[PDB]
Amino acid sequence: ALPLPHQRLRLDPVPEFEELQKAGPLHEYDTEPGMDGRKQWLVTGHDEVRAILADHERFSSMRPVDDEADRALLPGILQAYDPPDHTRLRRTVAPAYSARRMERLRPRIEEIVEECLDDFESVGAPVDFVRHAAWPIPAYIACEFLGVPRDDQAELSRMIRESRESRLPRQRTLSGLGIVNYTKRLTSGKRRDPGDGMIGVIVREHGAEISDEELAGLAEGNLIMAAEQMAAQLAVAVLLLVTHPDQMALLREKPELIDSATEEVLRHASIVEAPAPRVALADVRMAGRDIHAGDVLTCSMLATNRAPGDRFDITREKATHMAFGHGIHHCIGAPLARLQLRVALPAVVGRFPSLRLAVPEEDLRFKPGRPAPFAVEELPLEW
Ligand code: HEM
């Protein structure tokens, strides 16, 4: 029974949710299941969402649990920590995402794209864009980013894809363990020998600052996140271009619109519809409502990034979106995400000027964004 902040008509929010938004910025709405020991709050007002995420000190990211020390600790997963642990751990990883270090990666990303678009083009049209382009590209990039040996990348990417979208649970569980197990070896092997990866730079700069188990969970986490998020962001960006062919040719010619378009696909997709629920540590007054210590708030990225009447417009100037969230948890991988879109969208458009949907729009299936990211299951294309 999908909550209102995760319901969509295709890519757009639903009329009932946009109607709820009109009543105010804050709502008595149960988004999370379980409870009702704790009061539920749904946050829809833009300023109010910004304010909660910036106020980590009174709003924690840790999971609301009956007793502490009866929660899964989740080593290496940045969005599950609070300061100071998080302040500590964020500082550890941050170097790997420097503007400098990304620029080094740019050429290998360019290559990965061309190589994947050749394989995509290799199969005759129609081709599913989700399986032969949207998954492999970020998957491979995630492996190069992790310093995964070339001859392993193929297999490891299969497991990443399969652990996230297989119809069968056992297969999901199997591929799931393969990645945990592969990541452990690689992390300890990189402790011995710090190399090209992001595991390498973390050891060479903040080796002692991080425990072995916090490397392994981080590495795995960053690997899966990088892949699945970008698979969804890319597929949706392409779907949006393909169903606005003028907008496409407009970026085709005039390549400099890429940054502007990059923001617009982030805003419009908003593949992350809500960030981790926030838990009140103190009593707080906000927007005429009293929030008590127990209460759990769901921030709606969908309420903030979207409005009734939205048009996909890559020429939008004032993207004030929070697709990457806000505050200390603000996506640490945003520079990689933006780099990928900036490399990838020009390449597809510049290669397939007549890139076209091969089935009717109504035949498209969408993965709900309530678990993980919002996505298209399949994107059949011809050119
Ligand atoms: C592609 C589009 C992406 C979107 C829309 C997105 C969205 C987000 C959001 C909204 C958060 C905040 C979570 C919260 O406050 O509860 C977040 C955090 C995070 N993201 Fe992303 N992300 C994207 C890509 C990526 C990529 C490629 C990576 C890997 C490099 C990544 C790694 C992370 C990590 C490690 C965090 C936790 C950071 C922290 O808690 O301080 N994301 N992301």
**DSSP secondary structure string for all residues of 247-310:** HHHHHHSSGGGHHHHHHHHHHHH-S----SPEEESS-EEETTEEEPTT-EEEE-HHHHH--TT-
Whether the CB of 373 sits within 6 Å of ligand 1: no
Please measure the distance between the N-terminal and C-terminal CA atoms of the chain and give it in whole angstroms.
38
Distances (CA, A) of 278 to 47, 61, 282, 292: 16, 5, 12, 12
- Whether the bond into 84 is cis, omega within 30 of 0: yes
Q: Which residues pair with 279 in a beta bridge?
A: 60, 296
Structure tokens at 156: 């490891």
Q: What is the resolution of this structure in A?
A: 2.5
**How far does residue 225's CA lie from ligand 1's centre (Å)?**
7
- Whether the bond into 360 is cis, omega within 30 of 0: no
> Which atom of ligand 1 is closest in space to residue 341's alpha carbon?
1
Q: Which domains does the chain have, with CATH numbers?
A: 1-383 (1.10.630.10)
Method of determination is X-ray
Cβ atoms 137, 369 nearer than 8 A: no
Report the alpha-carbon distance of residue 366 to residue 11 in Å, rounded: 8
Sign of the Cα pseudo-torsion (360, 311, 266, 137, in order): positive
Nearest residue (CA) to ligand 1, atom 18: 331
Structure tokens at 121: 């083009």
* DSSP 8-class letter at 67: S
Residue type for 95, please?
Answer: P
CA 3: distance to chain centroid?
A: 20
Phi–psi pair at 298, nearest 5 degrees: -105, 115
**How far does residue 267's CA lie from ligand 1's centre (Å)?**
14
Cβ atoms 277, 298 nearer than 8 A: yes
What share of residues in the chain are helix, strand, coil (percent, to 5)? 55, 10, 35
Whether the CB of 90 sits within 6 Å of ligand 1: yes
CA 145: distance to chain centroid?
A: 16
Report the alpha-carbon distance of residue 131 to residue 379 in Å, rounded: 8
**How far does residue 249's CA lie from ligand 1's centre (Å)?**
30
For 24-28, the CB contacts below 8 A with 24+ separation are: 24/287, 25/287, 26/286, 26/287, 26/289
Phi–psi pair at 67, nearest 5 degrees: -135, 140
> Which atom of ligand 1 is closest in space to residue 322's alpha carbon?
10
Cβ atoms 340, 234 nearer than 8 A: yes
**How far does residue 207's CA lie from ligand 1's centre (Å)?**
23
Nearest residue (CA) to ligand 1, atom 23: 229
Report the alpha-carbon distance of residue 101 to residue 314 in Å, rounded: 28
Q: Which residues pair with 26 in a beta bridge?
A: 43
